[PDB]
Design a binder for these strands. Structure first.
Lengths: 161, 166, 52, 116, 121
RNA sequence: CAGAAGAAUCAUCGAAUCUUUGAACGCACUGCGCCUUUGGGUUCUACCAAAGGCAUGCCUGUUUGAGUGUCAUU
RNA sequence: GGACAUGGGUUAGUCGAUCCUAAGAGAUAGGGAAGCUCCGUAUGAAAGGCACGAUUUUUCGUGCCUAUCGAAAGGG
RNA sequence: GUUUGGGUAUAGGGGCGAAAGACUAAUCGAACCAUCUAGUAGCUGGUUC
RNA sequence: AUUGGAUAUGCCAUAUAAAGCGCUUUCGAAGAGUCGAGUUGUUUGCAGCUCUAAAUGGGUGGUCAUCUAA
RNA sequence: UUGACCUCAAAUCAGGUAGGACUACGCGCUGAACAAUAAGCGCAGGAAAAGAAAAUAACCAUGAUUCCCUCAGUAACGGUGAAGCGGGAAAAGCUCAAAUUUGAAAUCUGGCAACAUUUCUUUUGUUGUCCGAGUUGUAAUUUCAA
C-alpha cells in the first residue's frame, strides 16, 4: 500500500524472503560442554538447572513455581567458616572434580629466576649472607634497582625452588 | 604544575592582569573573523579539563557572538556548522566585552587515526555522536534543556493505557 | 472500529475453577455425553479409564 | 493517544527467550547475580526485607572477598550503601558466605613465560 | 556462440579483434533488418549482442584483475577496487581500533576477568 | 508468432556494466572553457578525435611563501 | 475533418542562436541571524599579470604594470 | 477627422505628531492551496423490524 | 560456505615486568563570568542583562543529615 | 649577514571528510488559532535519549539510568495534577582535569619499505626506517568508592 510496497508488488523481482522464525525453539547450549551434554532441549532453563543440581538464581523467585506432583550474634557467625556444600547430582559432582583436577594441573604458580635475576640475588647473597634482607636492600652498589627486603626475599625463595 | 596557577588566576577576571589582557585580546579577536581557527587554546588549563589534548586531531576554534538562547550554545552550533567534518567536544568562555562574548570550541576529527586509535576518545567517532551540539548533548546543551539529577529538574500522562484484562 | 475495543474478559479464578470442576463432573454422566452428540452407545464404562 | 497491550504475551515470551539466550552463553553460572538483603527506608516498610543493589565494601571485607574479585564471581558491589548497624552487616555477610560455599569456581588458563 | 571459458583463454588484443569482428557482423545484421530479413537473421542479432557483451565482460575482468594485481599490498588503491558495502560501514571503527583499550583496562581484564563458575543447589 | 536447439521471460548471486541528470562538482543551463596524455588522417606549425582531470567548506600532513610580529648571530 | 491507420518529410563556414554589453540580478570578501536564511557586489580581501638574465655561494634575483546571469528586436 | 512590445527595478493601512518617532498592524486590498478541524449548533433536516 | 565464544594441544612469550590483598613515625591535588545576588522574559527549571564568589567550602533537605555541580 | 620562532597565506599539493534522502519511533529549537499541540527549522540511531547521585529520605534507612504496576486523581496548587516509598523487568560499570617520567616523551600521525592478514587481490594490521606532531605536555599512574 506504500509507494515503496506497491513498487515491489508490481515488480518482477522476487521478495527477499527469509525463513528464520520458529517459536518455542529454545537457545542451544554453547559454553560449558558438561552442561551441553546433559541439557534436554525440550525443558525450560529452570527445569534444566534444577535437574542438573544448579541454581538458576541465588535470589527469590518472583512468582509461583510449578507443582507437578502432590508434594509429601554477629561475632560467632561472622567468624564461622561454612563447610562447603554437598554435590547433589552427578553433573555437579562432575563439574566439581573437573575444577579440582584443572586447579591441580594449574597449581605450580612459582617461577624460576632468569639469568639476570639469579645473578642479581646471588651477588647480594654472597656478601650479606641469606637472612639480612634489610641490609641487602640498603646496599646501594649491589642493589642498583633499589629492591626492598620483601622483593629480595621473593627472589631468594624463587631461586631455591 | 602550572595548571593550578592558571586555574586560580582565571578566577580573578577583573584584576589588573586579567582586565588588561581582556582588553588587548578582545581587540585582537574583533580584528579577526567572527569564526577563526585558534593556533592554540588561550586557556590551556581550561581546555584540557574540558577534554582537550595537544595531539593531532584536536582543533580549537574561536567565535564571537553578540550579547543581549545561551551564547555558549550559539557558539557551538555555529562553529559546528563551520567545521562540518569535526565533532564538537566542548566549549568555554574566553573573553567578553560590551558587545561580544568570546568562546573557544574544542573539536575532534573522527577521521584522523590519532583519534580512531585512542581508546579514551573513540566514542566520538561512533555515528551516534554526529552533531551532539545540534541535539543538546554538549555540556551547555544538557544544562540548557534541564537535564540534571535531583528534584529541581508528558507522554505517560497524555496516553490512556488500556490493558487486555481491564 | 478501534483496536482498543475490549477483547479479553476477566473471570474470577474461582469461577473458572468452578466451571472446570462442573465440566469434568458432566463428562462422567453418560446422558450428557449423548446429548452432547457423542457416539458412546457401546463404551464399556463412563468414565472410561485405560491403562498407563 | 491510547496505549494498547496486545504485545503483552509477546513481551512475556521475548523476555523468556532472553533468559534462555543468556543461559545459552553463560551456561553453568546463574542467570541472575546475588543481591543483598536490605531494609526498606520508611516507617511503613522497615519491618520487611527486600533485595538491595549490591554488597557494601565493609560487607565484602568481612566476608573475605576483595572488591575486585567480587564482580568476577558475580557478587555486585554497592559503593553507596553503608552498614549503620551490625544486623545489616551480619545479615549480608552470611549471605555472601553461604553463596561462597555453594560456589564452584572453574580455574583459568594463565600465561607462564619460560624464563623468570 | 562464444563460450566464456575459451574467451578467457585468450589474450587482450585477440579479444579486441574478435570484438571488432562481432561489431561488424552486428552492423551487417541490422542492415539486413532494415532491408527486409529472415527470422534466422533477426534471431542472430540477439546472439551477436550477447556475444559482444561476453567479450566485453572478459576484457573488463582481465583489465581489473591486472589492476588488482598491480595494487596488491598497497596502502592506497583505486576507489572502484575498494570495498563498497555502505557509506556508513566504511566510516565505522574497524574491529581492530574498536577493540583498542588503555593499558589500565588491559590490566583489569588480565588480572580480574569474568570467572567461570556455578552455584550448587 | 517466427526462430533457435548446458536450454531457460528459471533460480541464486560474491564478478561487472551502469546514458543525461539530480546533494550534483570546471563554468552556464541550445551551450562555453581550461589542463595532461595518446591517437587518426587522402592531406601533419593546421585540423580532428579519444582517454584522464579541473566545485565548495573543513581536518592531518607536505611544499612554497609573507610580515616596519618576537628574537639571535664579533 | 487539424479524425484514425500506415509510411515519408526539416540538410547552412556566410540565415539566426552561439560572442558582447544594458537597466538590473547575483555568487565570492565580510557581517548578521535560535534558525529556515538575510544584508553585502572592489567592501579595510594577501582579489594577477608581464618582461629581464652567459646560472644566482647550481636553495631566484631584478624591474614594470596592477565570477556569473540579463537582448533569437540593441552591438557583430 | 505620444502610445506600445521585450526586459526591468519597488514603496506600498490607519489615525498621533511641526518633524522625528512611535501604536498596532502589515506582505499590501486581497486571491488560491493544504493542514489545523471532526473550530464554535439552547438550531435545521433526517434517524431503519 | 562464512563466522562466534569456549576446550585440548603445538610453537612463541621483550617477566630486569605487571597486579590484588595487608600494613603505615609519609602524603592525598578535586573543574569560575561558574555558583550566587539583583532584575527582566518563558514555564522550581531555563534564557538575557547588571553585579559577581568560596574552601570542611559548596549544593540539597530536615545544630543535624545527605550529597559533591560547573 | 646568516638563522631560529611566531602568526598568517597559497597549491587541481599527499590523504581524508561534510552535504542530499528516508524520517514510524528518538533528541534539540521554534510555536499558533482554537497546547511543552499542529505547522515550521535543526540533528541522530537500530533504537534514541537518560545514566553511575552537588539522589532520596528522617527509617531497623535506601542507593546509576530506563521502563511497567502501584503510589493516586493523592499531596500541592487553585479544574490542573506530582514525587519518595512499595512491587516488578533488566542490571555494569566507569574515563578524565587537577601530581615531577624527570635516572632519561617512556606517547602518536604520516612517508617509504618489507611482512602478514582478509566476508575481501576489495579487509585489517605488524615490523623496520625516515620526516613530523608534541614539553604552551603526549604515555604510564590516580578519580574521592578513593
Amino acid at each position: 500500500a506504500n509507494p515503496r510496497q506497491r513498487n515491489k508488488q508490481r515488480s518482477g523481482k522476487p521478495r527477499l524472503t527469509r525463513r528464520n522464525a520458529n517459536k518455542k525453539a529454545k537457545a542451544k547450549i554453547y559454553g560449558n560442554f558438561v552442561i551441553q551434554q546433559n541439557w534436554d532441549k525440550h525443558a525450560t532453563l529452570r527445569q534444566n538447572y534444577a535437574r542438573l543440581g544448579l541454581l538458576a538464581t541465588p535470589n527469590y523467585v518472583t512468582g509461583g513455581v510449578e507443582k507437578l506432583y502432590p508434594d509429601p550474634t554477629l561475632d560467632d557467625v561472622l567468624d564461622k567458616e561454612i563447610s562447603i556444600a554437598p554435590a547433589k547430582t552427578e553433573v555437579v559432582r562432575q563439574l566439581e572434580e573437573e575444577a579440582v583436577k584443572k586447579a591441580a594441573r594449574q597449581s605450580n604458580k612459582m617461577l624460576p629466576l632468569s639469568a639476570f635475576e639469579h645473578a642479581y640475588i646471588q651477588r647480594l647473597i654472597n656478601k650479606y649472607g641469606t637472612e639480612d634482607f634489610e641490609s641487602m636492600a640498603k646496599d646501594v652498589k649491589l642493589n642498583s634497582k633499589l629492591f626492598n627486603g620483601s622483593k629480595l626475599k621473593n627472589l631468594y625463595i624463587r631461586m631455591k625452588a | 604544575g602550572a595548571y593550578k596557577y592558571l586555574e586560580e588566576l582565571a578566577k580573578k577576571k577583573q584584576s589588573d592582569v586579567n582586565l588588561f589582557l581582556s582588553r588587548v585580546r578582545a581587540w585582537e579577536y574583533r580584528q579577526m573573523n567572527v569564526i577563526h581557527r585558534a593556533s592554540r587554546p588561550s586557556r590551556p588549563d581550561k581546555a584540557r579539563r574540558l577534554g582537550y589534548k595537544a595531539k593531532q586531531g584536536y582543533v580549537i576554534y574561536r567565535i564571537r557572538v553578540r550579547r543581549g538562547r545561551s551564547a555558549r550554545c550559539t557558539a557551538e552550533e555555529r562553529v559546528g556548522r563551520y567545521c562540518s567534518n569535526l565533532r564538537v567536544l566542548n566549549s568555554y568562555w574566553v573573553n567578553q566585552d560590551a558587545t561580544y562574548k568570546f568562546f573557544e570550541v574544542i573539536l575532534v576529527d573522527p577521521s584522523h587515526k590519532a583519534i580512531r586509535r585512542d581508546p579514551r576518545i573513540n566514542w566520538i567517532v561512533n555515528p551516534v555522536h554526529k552533531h551532539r551540539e545540534s541535539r543538546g548533548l554538549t555540556s551547555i546543551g544538557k544544562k540548557s534543556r534541564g537535564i540534571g539529577k535531583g528534584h529541581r529538574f508528558w507522554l505517560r500522562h497524555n496516553t490512556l493505557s488500556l490493558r487486555r484484562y481491564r | 472500529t478501534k483496536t482498543w475495543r475490549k477483547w479479553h474478559v476477566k473471570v474470577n479464578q474461582n469461577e473458572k475453577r468452578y466451571a472446570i470442576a462442573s465440566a469434568v463432573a458432566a463428562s462422567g454422566v453418560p446422558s450428557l455425553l449423548l446429548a452432547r452428540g457423542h457416539r458412546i452407545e457401546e463404551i464399556p464404562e463412563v468414565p472410561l479409564v485405560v491403562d498407563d | 493517544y491510547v496505549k494498547t497491550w496486545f504485545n503483552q504475551p509477546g513481551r512475556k515470551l521475548r523476555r523468556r527467550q532472553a533468559r534462555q539466550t543468556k543461559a545459552a552463553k553463560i551456561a553453568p553460572r546463574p542467570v541472575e547475580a546475588i543481591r543483598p538483603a536490605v531494609k526498606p527506608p520508611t516507617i511503613r516498610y522497615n519491618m520487611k526485607v527486600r533485595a538491595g543493589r549490591g554488597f557494601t565494601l565493609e560487607e565484602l571485607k568481612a566476608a573475605g572477598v576483595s572488591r575486585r574479585v567480587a564482580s568476577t564471581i558475580g557478587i555486585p558491589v554497592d559503593h553507596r550503601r553503608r552498614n549503620r548497624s551490625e544486623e545489616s552487616l551480619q545479615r549480608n555477610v552470611e549471605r555472601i558466605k553461604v553463596y561462597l560455599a555453594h560456589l564452584i569456581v572453574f580455574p583459568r588458563k594463565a600465561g607462564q613465560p619460560k624464563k623468570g | 556462440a562464444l563460450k566464456t571459458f575459451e574467451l578467457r583463454k585468450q589474450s587482450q588484443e585477440n579479444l579486441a579483434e574478435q570484438l571488432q569482428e562481432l561489431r561488424q557482423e552486428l552492423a551487417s545484421l541490422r542492415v539486413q533488418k532494415i532491408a527486409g530479413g529472415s527470422g534466422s537473421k533477426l534471431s542472430k542479432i540477439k546472439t551477436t549482442r550477447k556475444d559482444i557483451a561476453r567479450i566485453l565482460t572478459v576484457i573488463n575482468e582481465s583489465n581489473r584483475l591486472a589492476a588488482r594485481e598491480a595494487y596488491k599490498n598497497k596502502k592506497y588503491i583505486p576507489l572502484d577496487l575498494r570495498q563498497k558495502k555502505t557509506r556508513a560501514i566504511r566510516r565505522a571503527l574497524t574491529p581492530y581500533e574498536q577493540s583498542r583499550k588503555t593499558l589500565k583496562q588491559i590490566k583489569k581484564e588480565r588480572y580480574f576477568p569474568l570467572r567461570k563458575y556455578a552455584l550448587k543447589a
